[PDB]
């Protein structure tokens, strides 16, 4: 996750991409205790809950949005940029992280790196990457040339100068999407051992109360815990 956050360049809002996170443990808590992000909003998710309970198919979306229009990119919120660039489902179970990128994403000369779709025929469906290179035509005003009848060109370069105000200054915002799916794999995120004492123990899925002593029984390398007649656990690895 840190590598995605520390990317040298961030994707434009029109060119926003989905990054699949799976087959690795994710430490959600590290993000909060870092507190290096200006803004952090968890919709339908609690930070403690995210650690204990996890959803498979985590998706990371990278795009640069001006701080003033950051509010538009929210679930249940409609904005010029949100309608034609990135759309969030209202019932979103995800956490969005935003931090100022003025130090590296802002250039005195200006950057043609970030572009937005000002004009689109229809509002985008949620999680739909925008792909409409052709200019407004509608067969009312069709030609390579610009009639000026609400035609122009949808993509316009963003301006991110140091002189620009903090709302104008670029902000790096990542959207994390959490969903529950049929596939078994899930991305979820440990005390010490007290022997010869009544303790509660929580071995990997096996819970109970008893005294733990070093044993002489040797398991096969694939066998986790042991049992006996009447099937009461009396050993553990």
């Amino acid at each position, epitope marked *: 996750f840190g590598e*995605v956050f520390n*990317a*040298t*360049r*961030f*994707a*434009s809002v*029109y*060119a*926003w*991409n989905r*990054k699949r996170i799976s087959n690795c443990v994710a430490d959600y808590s590290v993000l909060y205790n870092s507190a290096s992000f200006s803004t952090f909003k968890c919709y339908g998710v609690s930070p403690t809950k995210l650690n204990d309970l996890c959803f498979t198919n985590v998706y990371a979306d*990278s795009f640069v949005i001006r701080g003033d229009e950051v509010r538009q990119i929210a679930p249940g919120q409609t904005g010029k940029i949100a309608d034609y660039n990135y759309k969030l489902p209202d019932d979103f179970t995800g956490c969005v992280i935003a931090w100022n990128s003025n130090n590296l994403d802002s250039k005195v000369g200006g950057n*043609y*790196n*970030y*572009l937005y779709r000002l004009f689109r025929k229809s509002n985008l469906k949620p999680f739909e*990457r925008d*792909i409409s*290179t052709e200019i407004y035509q509608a067969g009312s005003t069709p030609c*390579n*040339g610009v009639e000026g009848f609400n035609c122009y*060109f949808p*993509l316009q*370069s963003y301006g991110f100068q140091p002189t620009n105000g903090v709302g104008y200054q670029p902000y790096r915002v990542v959207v994390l999407s959490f969903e529950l799916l049929h596939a078994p794999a899930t991305v979820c995120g440990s005390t010490n051992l007290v022997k010869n004492k009544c303790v509660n123990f929580n071995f990997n899925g096996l819970t109970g109360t008893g005294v733990l002593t070093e044993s002489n029984k040797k398991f096969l390398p694939f066998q986790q815990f042991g049992r006996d007649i009447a099937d009461t656990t009396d050993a553990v690895r």
Partner: antibody
Framework: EVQLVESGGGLVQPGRSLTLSCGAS????????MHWVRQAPGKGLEWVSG????????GYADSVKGRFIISRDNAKNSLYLHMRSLTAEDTALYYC????????????????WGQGTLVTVSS | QSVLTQPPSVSAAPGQKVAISCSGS????????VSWYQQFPGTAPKLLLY???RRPSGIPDRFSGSKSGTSATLGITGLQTGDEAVYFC???????????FGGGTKLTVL
């Protein structure tokens, strides 16, 4: 073996637009950064555009800045260059470039080069 | 905008060492190693040298060269007929934030 298919290159009028499509096969498209390099015949190679794993735009040649748009889809394994305000200077042979380094900041070399397509801009 | 400088054309007899010089500003060549590309006329360019002296698989050991300071040198030994090609040195510039490509040198045998 990495194969870089080239298409969407044809004779075009100056005040028109043209899209170039590069097909990536034999390697993971998302893993390796993709770059655009053009070379007019009888002239030295000229870097035009760069993109990375996160699809963030590395930059554009100063001459093509504000007239050229670069975009890629990791799922489709394809990258598209949109050219506007085409000029006689723009006329060249655009070869797809595969870059080993995603950040392309340092020690970044082009492992494979596409055959290329010929954009001609004339009245 | 800094431009990588290369001699226009070089001609040498087979079996004669060939030296090609790439000239760049400190910000471009100094920060990252130059990459040499051997392009046969009418063919797509093929990488000849990666990270200066190191050679990618499929490049002859006779190809060599050392970059000192802001200058990158390509050394060709055991030159043969059909080795004629245009050589381009490419080094991205941190200051310009754009990749820089050399004008190129036209190696040939009579």
């Amino acid at each position: 073996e990495v194969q870089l298919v080239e298409s969407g290159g044809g004779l075009v009028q100056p005040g028109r637009s043209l899209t170039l499509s590069c097909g990536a096969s034999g390697f993971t498209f998302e893993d390796y950064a993709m770059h655009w390099v053009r070379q007019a015949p009888g002239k030295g190679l000229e870097w035009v555009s760069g993109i990375d794993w996160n699809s963030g735009v590395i930059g554009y040649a100063d001459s093509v800045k504000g007239r050229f748009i670069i975009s890629r889809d990791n799922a489709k394994n394809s990258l598209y260059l949109h050219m506007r305000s085409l000029t006689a200077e723009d006329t060249a042979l655009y070869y797809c470039a595969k870059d080993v380094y995603s950040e392309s900041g340092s020690g970044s070399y082009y492992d494979y080069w596409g055959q290329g397509t010929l954009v001609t801009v004339s009245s | 905008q800094s431009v990588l400088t290369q001699p226009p054309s070089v001609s040498a007899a087979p079996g004669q060492k060939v030296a090609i010089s790439c000239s760049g500003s400190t910000s471009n060549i100094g920060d990252n190693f130059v990459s040499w590309y051997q392009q046969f006329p009418g063919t797509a360019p093929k990488l000849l040298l990666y990270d200066d002296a190191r050679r990618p698989s499929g490049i002859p050991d006779r190809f060599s060269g050392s970059k000192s300071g802001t200058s990158a040198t390509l050394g060709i030994t055991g030159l043969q007929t059909g080795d004629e090609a245009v050589y381009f040195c490419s080094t991205w510039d941190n200051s310009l934030n754009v990749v820089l490509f050399g004008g190129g040198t036209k190696l040939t045998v009579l």
